């Protein structure tokens, strides 16, 4: 093969590898975002349940 074909192939391989790395970063980002959402929901539930516990204590 010519030098230009070899240049194209090394460039394509490099860019494919770069894309895979970017995909891994994006997957980590999505995991962190879903965990953040779950944390906010768990905190909301904890706060509400503190209110429910107070209601039962005052009813007793």
Residues 1-20 that bind a second copy (CB under 8 A): none
Q: Which of residues 5 and 51 has its CB atom nearest to a second copy in the complex?
A: 51
- 10 torsion bin: left (phi>0), alpha (psi -120 to 50), beta (else): alpha
Q: Is the dihedral of CA 11, 12, 17, 22 positive or negative?
A: positive
32 touching a second copy, by CB under 8 A: yes
Residues forming contacts to a second copy in the complex (CB under 8 A) are 21, 24-25, 28-29, 31-32, 35-36, 38-39, 42-43, 45-46, 49-50, 52-53, 56-57, 59-60
């Amino acid at each position: 093969g010519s030098v230009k074909l070899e240049m194209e192939m090394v460039t394509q391989q490099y860019e494919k590898a770069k894309a895979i790395q970017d995909e891994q970063l994006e997957r980590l980002t999505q995991i962190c975002q879903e965990q953040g959402f779950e944390i906010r929901q768990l905190r909301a539930h904890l706060a509400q349940q503190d209110l429910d516990l107070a209601a039962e204590r005052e009813a007793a």
